[PDB]
Structure 1
Amino acid sequence: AQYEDGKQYTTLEKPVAGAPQVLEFFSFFCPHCYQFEEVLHISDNVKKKLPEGVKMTKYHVNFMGGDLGKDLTQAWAVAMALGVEDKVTVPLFEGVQKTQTIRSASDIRDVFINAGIKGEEYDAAWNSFVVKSLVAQQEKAAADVQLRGVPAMFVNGKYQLNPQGMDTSNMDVFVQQYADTVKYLSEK
Protein backbone atom coordinates (compact mmCIF):
# COMPACT_ATOMS: atom_id res chain seq x y z
CA ALA A 1 0.00 0.00 0.00
CA GLN A 2 1.01 3.67 -0.05
CA TYR A 3 0.13 4.19 3.59
CA GLU A 4 1.47 1.28 5.66
CA ASP A 5 1.12 0.74 9.36
CA GLY A 6 4.59 1.26 10.74
CA LYS A 7 5.65 3.66 8.00
CA GLN A 8 3.76 6.96 8.23
CA TYR A 9 1.87 5.88 11.31
CA THR A 10 1.79 3.14 13.92
CA THR A 11 -1.21 1.50 15.53
CA LEU A 12 -1.97 1.50 19.23
CA GLU A 13 -2.32 -2.12 20.33
CA LYS A 14 -4.30 -0.65 23.21
CA PRO A 15 -6.78 1.70 21.45
CA VAL A 16 -8.36 4.50 23.42
CA ALA A 17 -12.15 4.79 23.42
CA GLY A 18 -13.92 8.16 23.30
CA ALA A 19 -10.71 10.02 22.41
CA PRO A 20 -10.53 13.43 20.75
CA GLN A 21 -10.68 12.96 16.97
CA VAL A 22 -7.35 14.63 16.23
CA LEU A 23 -5.19 14.92 19.35
CA GLU A 24 -1.77 16.62 19.44
CA PHE A 25 0.79 16.70 22.27
CA PHE A 26 3.57 19.21 22.71
CA SER A 27 5.91 20.83 25.25
CA PHE A 28 7.25 24.34 25.17
CA PHE A 29 10.60 22.71 26.14
CA CYS A 30 10.54 20.37 23.15
CA PRO A 31 12.78 21.62 20.32
CA HIS A 32 10.93 19.73 17.56
CA CYS A 33 7.64 21.21 18.88
CA TYR A 34 9.19 24.61 18.39
CA GLN A 35 9.94 23.72 14.77
CA PHE A 36 6.46 22.12 14.35
CA GLU A 37 4.75 25.24 15.56
CA GLU A 38 6.47 28.26 14.10
CA VAL A 39 8.63 26.99 11.27
CA LEU A 40 6.32 24.25 9.96
CA HIS A 41 2.85 25.26 11.24
CA ILE A 42 1.77 21.62 11.38
CA SER A 43 -1.39 22.15 13.42
CA ASP A 44 -2.51 24.78 11.01
CA ASN A 45 -1.86 22.79 7.86
CA VAL A 46 -3.47 19.69 9.31
CA LYS A 47 -6.58 21.68 10.13
CA LYS A 48 -6.75 22.98 6.53
CA LYS A 49 -6.97 19.42 5.20
CA LEU A 50 -9.15 17.92 7.88
CA PRO A 51 -12.68 16.88 6.90
CA GLU A 52 -15.95 18.55 7.66
CA GLY A 53 -16.88 18.19 11.30
CA VAL A 54 -13.48 17.38 12.80
CA LYS A 55 -12.36 18.80 16.15
CA MET A 56 -8.67 19.43 16.68
CA THR A 57 -7.29 19.17 20.22
CA LYS A 58 -3.83 20.20 21.42
CA TYR A 59 -2.46 19.43 24.89
CA HIS A 60 0.74 20.27 26.81
CA VAL A 61 2.71 17.60 28.74
CA ASN A 62 4.49 17.54 32.10
CA PHE A 63 7.53 15.31 31.54
CA MET A 64 9.86 18.01 30.16
CA GLY A 65 11.34 20.85 32.15
CA GLY A 66 10.48 19.70 35.66
CA ASP A 67 8.66 22.26 37.77
CA LEU A 68 8.31 24.79 34.96
CA GLY A 69 6.94 21.99 32.79
CA LYS A 70 3.92 21.45 35.04
CA ASP A 71 3.49 25.23 35.40
CA LEU A 72 3.44 25.36 31.65
CA THR A 73 0.71 22.71 31.55
CA GLN A 74 -1.36 24.79 33.98
CA ALA A 75 -0.78 27.94 31.89
CA TRP A 76 -1.81 26.11 28.72
CA ALA A 77 -4.95 25.13 30.64
CA VAL A 78 -5.43 28.86 31.24
CA ALA A 79 -4.84 29.58 27.54
CA MET A 80 -7.56 27.05 26.59
CA ALA A 81 -10.10 28.34 29.09
CA LEU A 82 -9.65 31.96 27.98
CA GLY A 83 -9.37 30.98 24.30
CA VAL A 84 -6.08 32.79 23.88
CA GLU A 85 -3.94 29.87 22.62
CA ASP A 86 -3.28 31.77 19.39
CA LYS A 87 -1.97 34.74 21.37
CA VAL A 88 0.48 33.04 23.76
CA THR A 89 1.85 30.11 21.80
CA VAL A 90 4.54 31.96 19.96
CA PRO A 91 5.75 34.11 22.89
CA LEU A 92 5.83 31.05 25.21
CA PHE A 93 7.96 29.10 22.75
CA GLU A 94 10.37 31.96 22.29
CA GLY A 95 10.45 32.66 26.02
CA VAL A 96 11.46 29.09 26.92
CA GLN A 97 13.72 28.22 23.96
CA LYS A 98 14.94 31.38 22.20
CA THR A 99 15.38 34.25 24.63
CA GLN A 100 15.28 32.05 27.78
CA THR A 101 13.47 34.63 29.82
CA ILE A 102 10.91 32.16 31.15
CA ARG A 103 12.29 30.74 34.35
CA SER A 104 9.33 30.89 36.70
CA ALA A 105 5.54 30.83 36.86
CA SER A 106 5.84 34.57 37.16
CA ASP A 107 7.66 34.86 33.87
CA ILE A 108 5.02 32.67 32.25
CA ARG A 109 2.36 35.06 33.54
CA ASP A 110 4.18 38.06 31.98
CA VAL A 111 3.68 36.62 28.49
CA PHE A 112 -0.04 36.60 29.15
CA ILE A 113 0.03 40.16 30.59
CA ASN A 114 2.01 41.42 27.61
CA ALA A 115 -0.40 39.63 25.29
CA GLY A 116 -3.26 41.61 26.77
CA ILE A 117 -4.91 39.25 29.27
CA LYS A 118 -5.51 41.10 32.50
CA GLY A 119 -3.68 40.13 35.68
CA GLU A 120 -6.79 39.47 37.69
CA GLU A 121 -8.31 37.57 34.78
CA TYR A 122 -5.23 35.39 34.43
CA ASP A 123 -4.84 34.79 38.16
CA ALA A 124 -8.54 34.01 38.40
CA ALA A 125 -8.19 31.45 35.61
CA TRP A 126 -4.90 30.12 37.05
CA ASN A 127 -6.54 29.26 40.36
CA SER A 128 -9.93 28.21 39.08
CA PHE A 129 -11.11 24.60 39.27
CA VAL A 130 -12.20 24.85 35.60
CA VAL A 131 -8.47 25.08 34.95
CA LYS A 132 -7.83 22.25 37.43
CA SER A 133 -9.97 19.86 35.39
CA LEU A 134 -8.36 21.01 32.12
CA VAL A 135 -4.98 20.14 33.64
CA ALA A 136 -6.50 16.77 34.58
CA GLN A 137 -7.66 16.16 31.01
CA GLN A 138 -4.26 16.90 29.49
CA GLU A 139 -2.68 14.53 31.92
CA LYS A 140 -5.38 11.96 31.45
CA ALA A 141 -5.09 12.03 27.65
CA ALA A 142 -1.30 11.65 27.75
CA ALA A 143 -1.71 8.89 30.30
CA ASP A 144 -4.22 6.98 28.18
CA VAL A 145 -1.59 6.46 25.48
CA GLN A 146 1.41 6.11 27.79
CA LEU A 147 3.07 9.10 26.12
CA ARG A 148 6.87 9.31 26.49
CA GLY A 149 7.79 11.63 23.63
CA VAL A 150 6.60 14.80 21.89
CA PRO A 151 5.66 16.15 19.35
CA ALA A 152 2.98 13.50 19.02
CA MET A 153 -0.28 13.18 17.16
CA PHE A 154 -3.00 10.55 17.54
CA VAL A 155 -6.09 10.07 15.38
CA ASN A 156 -9.33 8.58 16.75
CA GLY A 157 -7.55 6.99 19.69
CA LYS A 158 -6.09 4.35 17.40
CA TYR A 159 -3.38 5.75 15.15
CA GLN A 160 -0.21 7.59 15.93
CA LEU A 161 1.61 9.74 13.37
CA ASN A 162 5.11 8.53 12.58
CA PRO A 163 7.06 11.54 11.22
CA GLN A 164 10.41 9.69 11.12
CA GLY A 165 9.10 7.76 8.09
CA MET A 166 8.42 10.79 5.83
CA ASP A 167 11.04 12.65 3.74
CA THR A 168 12.61 15.73 5.37
CA SER A 169 14.54 17.06 2.34
CA ASN A 170 11.89 19.70 1.70
CA MET A 171 10.00 21.20 4.65
CA ASP A 172 6.86 22.07 2.68
CA VAL A 173 6.75 18.52 1.41
CA PHE A 174 7.17 17.08 4.91
CA VAL A 175 4.16 19.11 6.10
CA GLN A 176 1.83 18.10 3.24
CA GLN A 177 2.76 14.49 3.67
CA TYR A 178 2.10 14.80 7.39
CA ALA A 179 -1.27 16.45 6.88
CA ASP A 180 -2.33 14.09 4.11
CA THR A 181 -1.49 11.22 6.45
CA VAL A 182 -3.74 12.71 9.16
CA LYS A 183 -6.55 13.10 6.63
CA TYR A 184 -6.04 9.53 5.46
CA LEU A 185 -6.10 8.23 9.02
CA SER A 186 -9.13 10.42 9.73
CA GLU A 187 -11.22 8.74 7.01
CA LYS A 188 -10.20 5.19 7.97
Structure 2
Amino acid sequence: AQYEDGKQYTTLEKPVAGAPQVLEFFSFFCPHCYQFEEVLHISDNVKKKLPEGVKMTKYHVNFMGGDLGKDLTQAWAVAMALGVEDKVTVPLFEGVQKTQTIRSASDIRDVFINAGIKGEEYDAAWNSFVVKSLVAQQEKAAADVQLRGVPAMFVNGKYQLNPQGMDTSNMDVFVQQYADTVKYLSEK
Protein backbone atom coordinates (compact mmCIF):
# COMPACT_ATOMS: atom_id res chain seq x y z
CA ALA A 1 0.00 0.00 0.00
CA GLN A 2 1.08 3.65 -0.20
CA TYR A 3 0.90 4.16 3.55
CA GLU A 4 2.33 1.21 5.46
CA ASP A 5 2.62 0.48 9.13
CA GLY A 6 6.30 0.59 10.01
CA LYS A 7 6.95 3.00 7.15
CA GLN A 8 5.49 6.51 7.56
CA TYR A 9 4.09 5.54 10.91
CA THR A 10 4.13 2.77 13.50
CA THR A 11 1.23 1.41 15.48
CA LEU A 12 1.17 1.36 19.25
CA GLU A 13 0.77 -2.24 20.35
CA LYS A 14 -0.51 -0.61 23.54
CA PRO A 15 -3.23 1.79 22.31
CA VAL A 16 -4.07 4.79 24.52
CA ALA A 17 -7.79 5.36 25.21
CA GLY A 18 -9.24 8.89 25.41
CA ALA A 19 -6.02 10.44 24.10
CA PRO A 20 -6.03 13.79 22.25
CA GLN A 21 -6.72 13.42 18.53
CA VAL A 22 -3.41 14.97 17.44
CA LEU A 23 -0.80 14.87 20.20
CA GLU A 24 2.68 16.34 19.72
CA PHE A 25 5.62 16.11 22.18
CA PHE A 26 8.71 18.31 22.21
CA SER A 27 11.52 19.80 24.30
CA PHE A 28 13.09 23.22 24.05
CA PHE A 29 16.41 21.29 24.33
CA CYS A 30 15.63 19.13 21.30
CA PRO A 31 17.52 20.07 18.08
CA HIS A 32 15.00 18.49 15.63
CA CYS A 33 12.20 20.18 17.59
CA TYR A 34 13.79 23.56 16.94
CA GLN A 35 13.84 22.69 13.24
CA PHE A 36 10.19 21.46 13.41
CA GLU A 37 9.19 24.81 14.88
CA GLU A 38 11.40 27.40 13.19
CA VAL A 39 12.30 25.97 9.79
CA LEU A 40 9.56 23.45 8.99
CA HIS A 41 6.52 24.81 10.88
CA ILE A 42 5.25 21.23 11.23
CA SER A 43 2.41 21.94 13.69
CA ASP A 44 1.09 24.67 11.48
CA ASN A 45 1.17 22.69 8.24
CA VAL A 46 -0.52 19.77 9.95
CA LYS A 47 -3.31 22.10 11.12
CA LYS A 48 -3.82 23.45 7.61
CA LYS A 49 -4.51 19.91 6.36
CA LEU A 50 -6.50 18.56 9.31
CA PRO A 51 -10.31 18.18 8.98
CA GLU A 52 -12.90 20.33 10.64
CA GLY A 53 -13.55 19.31 14.26
CA VAL A 54 -10.06 18.11 15.21
CA LYS A 55 -8.05 19.70 18.03
CA MET A 56 -4.25 19.71 18.26
CA THR A 57 -2.32 19.29 21.48
CA LYS A 58 1.37 20.01 22.15
CA TYR A 59 3.22 19.05 25.33
CA HIS A 60 6.75 19.61 26.70
CA VAL A 61 8.75 16.72 28.17
CA ASN A 62 11.08 16.34 31.16
CA PHE A 63 13.63 13.81 29.97
CA MET A 64 15.95 16.39 28.37
CA GLY A 65 17.98 19.00 30.21
CA GLY A 66 17.58 17.84 33.80
CA ASP A 67 16.46 20.56 36.20
CA LEU A 68 15.92 23.20 33.49
CA GLY A 69 14.00 20.62 31.48
CA LYS A 70 11.40 20.38 34.26
CA ASP A 71 11.26 24.18 34.70
CA LEU A 72 10.53 24.35 31.00
CA THR A 73 7.67 21.84 31.30
CA GLN A 74 6.17 23.99 34.08
CA ALA A 75 6.75 27.14 31.96
CA TRP A 76 4.98 25.51 29.05
CA ALA A 77 2.05 24.76 31.38
CA VAL A 78 2.08 28.49 32.24
CA ALA A 79 2.08 29.29 28.54
CA MET A 80 -0.91 26.94 27.95
CA ALA A 81 -2.83 28.31 30.94
CA LEU A 82 -2.33 31.95 29.79
CA GLY A 83 -2.75 31.10 26.11
CA VAL A 84 0.57 32.69 25.19
CA GLU A 85 2.21 29.76 23.36
CA ASP A 86 2.58 31.69 20.15
CA LYS A 87 4.51 34.45 21.91
CA VAL A 88 7.07 32.46 23.87
CA THR A 89 7.81 29.44 21.70
CA VAL A 90 10.36 31.11 19.49
CA PRO A 91 12.23 33.06 22.21
CA LEU A 92 12.37 29.94 24.39
CA PHE A 93 13.85 27.82 21.58
CA GLU A 94 16.40 30.51 20.71
CA GLY A 95 17.15 31.25 24.35
CA VAL A 96 17.98 27.59 24.96
CA GLN A 97 19.65 26.54 21.68
CA LYS A 98 20.78 29.68 19.78
CA THR A 99 21.87 32.36 22.22
CA GLN A 100 22.12 30.05 25.24
CA THR A 101 20.88 32.81 27.48
CA ILE A 102 18.42 30.55 29.31
CA ARG A 103 20.16 28.89 32.26
CA SER A 104 17.70 29.21 35.13
CA ALA A 105 14.00 29.53 35.89
CA SER A 106 14.52 33.29 36.21
CA ASP A 107 15.82 33.42 32.64
CA ILE A 108 12.73 31.52 31.45
CA ARG A 109 10.63 34.04 33.33
CA ASP A 110 12.49 36.91 31.54
CA VAL A 111 11.34 35.58 28.15
CA PHE A 112 7.69 35.83 29.28
CA ILE A 113 8.23 39.35 30.71
CA ASN A 114 9.81 40.51 27.48
CA ALA A 115 6.89 39.01 25.56
CA GLY A 116 4.59 41.25 27.59
CA ILE A 117 3.18 38.86 30.17
CA LYS A 118 3.11 40.69 33.49
CA GLY A 119 5.41 39.51 36.27
CA GLU A 120 2.55 39.31 38.71
CA GLU A 121 0.50 37.30 36.22
CA TYR A 122 3.37 34.92 35.44
CA ASP A 123 4.33 34.17 39.06
CA ALA A 124 0.71 33.63 40.01
CA ALA A 125 0.30 31.17 37.13
CA TRP A 126 3.66 29.50 37.89
CA ASN A 127 2.56 28.76 41.46
CA SER A 128 -1.07 27.89 40.67
CA PHE A 129 -2.64 24.43 41.09
CA VAL A 130 -4.18 24.80 37.65
CA VAL A 131 -0.61 24.83 36.34
CA LYS A 132 0.25 21.92 38.67
CA SER A 133 -2.45 19.78 37.03
CA LEU A 134 -1.40 20.99 33.54
CA VAL A 135 2.12 19.72 34.35
CA ALA A 136 0.51 16.42 35.47
CA GLN A 137 -1.32 16.12 32.14
CA GLN A 138 1.90 16.60 30.15
CA GLU A 139 3.66 13.95 32.19
CA LYS A 140 0.73 11.49 32.12
CA ALA A 141 0.29 11.79 28.34
CA ALA A 142 4.00 11.10 27.83
CA ALA A 143 3.92 8.25 30.33
CA ASP A 144 0.93 6.68 28.52
CA VAL A 145 3.04 6.11 25.38
CA GLN A 146 6.29 5.47 27.28
CA LEU A 147 7.98 8.33 25.45
CA ARG A 148 11.78 8.13 25.14
CA GLY A 149 12.24 10.47 22.18
CA VAL A 150 11.12 13.79 20.72
CA PRO A 151 9.83 15.25 18.42
CA ALA A 152 6.94 12.84 18.47
CA MET A 153 3.43 12.96 17.14
CA PHE A 154 0.63 10.51 17.94
CA VAL A 155 -2.77 10.25 16.24
CA ASN A 156 -5.76 9.28 18.50
CA GLY A 157 -3.59 7.32 20.84
CA LYS A 158 -2.79 4.55 18.43
CA TYR A 159 -0.52 5.78 15.62
CA GLN A 160 2.93 7.35 15.86
CA LEU A 161 4.47 9.41 13.04
CA ASN A 162 7.71 8.02 11.66
CA PRO A 163 9.62 10.85 9.94
CA GLN A 164 12.78 8.71 9.48
CA GLY A 165 10.83 7.01 6.70
CA MET A 166 10.17 10.13 4.54
CA ASP A 167 12.62 11.86 2.12
CA THR A 168 14.53 14.84 3.52
CA SER A 169 16.15 16.07 0.32
CA ASN A 170 13.58 18.80 0.07
CA MET A 171 12.26 20.37 3.26
CA ASP A 172 8.92 21.41 1.72
CA VAL A 173 8.21 17.94 0.38
CA PHE A 174 9.06 16.43 3.77
CA VAL A 175 6.59 18.67 5.56
CA GLN A 176 3.74 17.85 3.14
CA GLN A 177 4.44 14.14 3.37
CA TYR A 178 4.37 14.51 7.14
CA ALA A 179 1.11 16.51 7.13
CA ASP A 180 -0.58 14.25 4.57
CA THR A 181 0.38 11.33 6.75
CA VAL A 182 -1.27 12.90 9.78
CA LYS A 183 -4.40 13.49 7.66
CA TYR A 184 -4.44 9.87 6.42
CA LEU A 185 -4.08 8.54 9.98
CA SER A 186 -6.76 10.95 11.10
CA GLU A 187 -9.29 9.58 8.56
CA LYS A 188 -8.32 6.04 9.45
TM-score by length of 2: 1.00
1:78-106 per-residue CA deviation (whole Å, 9 max, x = no partner) reads 00000000000000000000000000000
RMSD: 0.2
Equivalence for 1:120:
120
Q: How far off is 1:162 after superposition?
A: 0.1
Query: Residues of 2 paired with 1:41 and 1:52: CA distance?
Result: 20
* Shift, 1:74, TM fit: 0.1
Q: CA deviation at 1:52?
A: 0.6
CA displacement at 1:116 relative to structure 2:
0.1
**SS in structure 1 of the partner of residue 173 of structure 2:** helix
SS, match of residue 48 in structure 1: helix
Q: Which SS does the other structure have where 2:154 is aligned? A: strand
Structure 1 stretches of 4+ with a deviation exceeding 6 A read none
Aligned-partner Cα distance in 2 for 1:157–1:173: 26
Instruction: Give, in angstroms, the shift of residue 128 of structure 1.
Output: 0.1
Deviation at 1:68, TM superposition (A): 0.1
Which consecutive residues of structure 2, in runs of 5 or more, have no partner in the other structure? none
Q: Could you tell me which residue of structure 1 aligns to residue 13 of structure 2?
A: 13
Task: Please list the CA deviations of residues 152-178 of structure 1 after superposition, one character each: whole Å capped at 9, or x if unmatched.
Answer: 000000000000000000000000000
CA distance in 1, matches of 2:183, 2:93: 27
Distance in 2, matches of 1:126 and 1:156, equals: 30
Deviations 1:51-86 (A, max 9, x none): 010000000000000000000000000000000000
Q: Give identity over the alignment, percent.
A: 100
SS at match of 2:29: coil
Q: Report 1:98-117 matches (<5 A).
A: 98-117=98-117
- The Cα of 1:137 is off from its aligned counterpart by 0.1
- How many residue pairs end up in the alignment? 188
Instruction: Name the residue aligned to 2:183.
Output: 183
